[PDB]
């Protein structure tokens, strides 16, 4: 008989450890463990959402005829790891084999790749199809290309994929449709929510009661844990969002924290959407006159393109991409970060929605909380594991390349990006946010100053000698360059009572 090991991102009836189950002999395992719920802080509402949408998952494979060994974090004998788990799952069992399929995360990797010795069991680790790319061909993509950038790579799954091909060309004569502010809009239907099911309540009470000083709060979840309700979700973005996806995507509005997204990076994530499904979903929709190619295009190229590209880097980085620190930067993550109790408007926004919600949309991440710990010279480990803990979408694959690449620039441009650097000039461009702040995006001296003006200018004189031959820095440098002597030095004092706020307030926490 054959141990089946499902892990929690894996929730797809079709992953490719069931592939030749004998659902008479074999079983499948999925556990609930403290190591996976405490690696690092998670939301409160991203550890009730996985551990729902496990036991949801569980429970559908029953009603598909597996027997299934579930482990419950809450479990007398619950052995505490996917080790623990699995040995205990042998000895109940007795398993000629183990299958599973690969996971998300080097540290995941390192203790799967322990099974065989640990137990003396043949075990089978899978490719995972559901990514579009394996790891031998993005390795074989990337041997011999000095400069990588997702531009090159995305055109590869374009031909790959065949998503919005006509034969060899891309439909509508270019690769790429690649910003505006948007407006409030009233019309704007609301995403759809989900109210919490038996099972759900249960776990939430239970995540409660097992992680109470975690980061976030648990009211009004409403995340789908299901099969049907994430394709419920995928339903409403095509119907009510994607035509003015592209329009929107870097807007950002006060009362407004979804525009025009899909909120579904969450079910993607675990198994419960399929992200190839997802973008014939789109491309489906364009066929038939309901969004314009921008939008359709610009979906698709974060999948397909940005997702797609950043799996590929983390496991073509290493495990040690983590400790990337271009900048060498040692400050500690701002307080703040934690509350969202800060006099900075755009800030106490964004860390309060990601508080409530366990999501912030992409250039909120980028632009806000990431512009900000880039400017603030934040120590790029500190601010990838806030990232990774605070959205319920995230898993160190995904994360890691997004904040230490796209956002902090802590790899020095491995991934292709450019520095995302800005100021108060840009958040007042883009969002609303400034409208309400006590502080005024058009100022960079005085009390009443926006913290990223003078902290913009100071980022880059800090870090010129690295950041000088820079193409896209070439303006400010010449700008920064024309500036008087005593302009650049009370900018930099101006830069420095910021971080001395922050390093005395980071003393005492
Ligand atoms: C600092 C930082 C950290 C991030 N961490 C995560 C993470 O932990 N998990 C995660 O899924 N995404 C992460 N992202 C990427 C992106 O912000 C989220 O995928 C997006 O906010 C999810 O919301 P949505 O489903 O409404 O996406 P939409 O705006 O509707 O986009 C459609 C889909 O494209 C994908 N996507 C879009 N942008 C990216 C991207 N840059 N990288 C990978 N996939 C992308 C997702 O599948 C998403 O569902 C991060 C970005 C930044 C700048
Ligand atoms: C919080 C959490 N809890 C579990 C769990 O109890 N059991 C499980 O199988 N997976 C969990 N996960 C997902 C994993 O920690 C990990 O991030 C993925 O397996 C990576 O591929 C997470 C994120
Ligand atoms: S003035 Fe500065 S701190 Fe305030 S909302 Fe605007 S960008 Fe954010
Ligand atoms: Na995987």
Redesign the pocket.
């Known amino acids: 008989s054959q141990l089946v090991l499902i892990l929690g991102d894996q929730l797809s009836p079709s992953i490719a450890a069931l592939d030749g189950v004998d659902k008479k002999q074999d079983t499948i395992v999925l556990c609930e463990v403290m190591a996976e719920a405490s690696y690092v802080g998670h939301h409160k509402k991203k550890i009730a959402f996985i551990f729902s949408a496990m036991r949801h998952f569980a429970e559908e494979l029953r009603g598909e005829g597996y027997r299934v060994r579930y482990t419950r974090i809450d479990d007398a004998d619950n052995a505490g790891s996917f080790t623990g788990e699995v040995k205990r799952a042998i000895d109940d069992l007795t398993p000629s084999r183990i299958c599973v399929t690969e996971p998300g995360e080097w540290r995941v990797r390192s203790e799967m790749d322990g099974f065989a010795g640990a137990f003396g069991i043949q075990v089978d680790i899978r490719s995972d199809r559901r990514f579009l790319s394996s790891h031998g061909e993005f390795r074989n993509w990337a041997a011999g290309r000095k400069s990588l950038t997702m531009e090159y790579f995305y055109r590869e799954m374009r031909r790959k994929t065949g998503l919005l091909m006509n034969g060899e060309q891309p439909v509508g004569g270019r690769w790429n449709f690649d910003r505006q502010p948007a407006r409030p809009d009233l019309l704007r239907p609301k995403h759809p929510v989900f109210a919490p099911d038996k099972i759900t309540k249960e776990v939430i009470d239970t995540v409660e009661r097992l992680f109470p000083d975690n980061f976030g709060k648990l009211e009004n979840f409403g995340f789908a844990v299901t099969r049907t309700d994430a394709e419920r979700a995928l339903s409403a973005f095509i119907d009510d969002f994607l035509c003015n996806f592209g329009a929107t995507q870097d807007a950002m509005l006060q009362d407004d924290p979804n525009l025009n997204?899909?909120?579904?990076?969450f079910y993607?994530?675990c198994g419960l959407l399929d992200?190839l499904d997802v973008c014939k979903a789109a491309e489906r929709a364009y066929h038939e006159g309901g969004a314009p190619l921008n939008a359709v295009e610009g979906?698709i190229r974060?999948?397909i393109g940005?997702?797609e590209y950043?799996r590929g880097i983390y496991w073509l980085a290493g495990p040690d991409y983590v400790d990337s620190n271009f900048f060498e930067n040692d400050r500690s993550l701002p307080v703040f970060y934690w509350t969202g109790k800060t006099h900075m408007n755009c800030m106490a926004k964004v860390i309060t929605e990601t508080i409530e919600n366990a999501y912030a949309?992409?250039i909120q991440?980028?632009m806000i909380t990431?512009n900000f710990a880039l400017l603030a010279g934040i120590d790029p480990k500190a601010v990838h594991r806030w990232?990774?803990e605070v959205?319920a979408?995230?898993?160190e694959w995904?994360?890691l390349p997004?904040?230490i690449g796209?956002?902090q620039f802590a790899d020095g441009g491995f991934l292709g990006t450019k520095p995302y650097a800005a100021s108060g000039n840009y958040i007042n461009r883009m969002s609303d946010y400034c409208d309400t702040c006590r502080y005024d995006p058009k100022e960079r001296l005085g009390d009443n100053a926006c913290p990223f003006n003078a902290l913009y200018w100071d980022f880059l004189a800090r870090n010129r000698e690295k950041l000088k031959s820079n193409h896209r820095l070439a303006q400010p440098y010449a700008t920064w360059a024309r500036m008087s002597e005593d302009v650049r030095h009370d900018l930099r004092a101006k830069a420095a009572a910021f971080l001395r706020k922050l390093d005395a307030a980071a003393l005492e926490h």
């Open positions: 997204h899909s909120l579904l990076s993607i994530n992200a979906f974060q999948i940005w997702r950043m949309h992409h991440r980028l990431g990232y990774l959205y979408d995230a898993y995904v994360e997004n904040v796209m956002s």
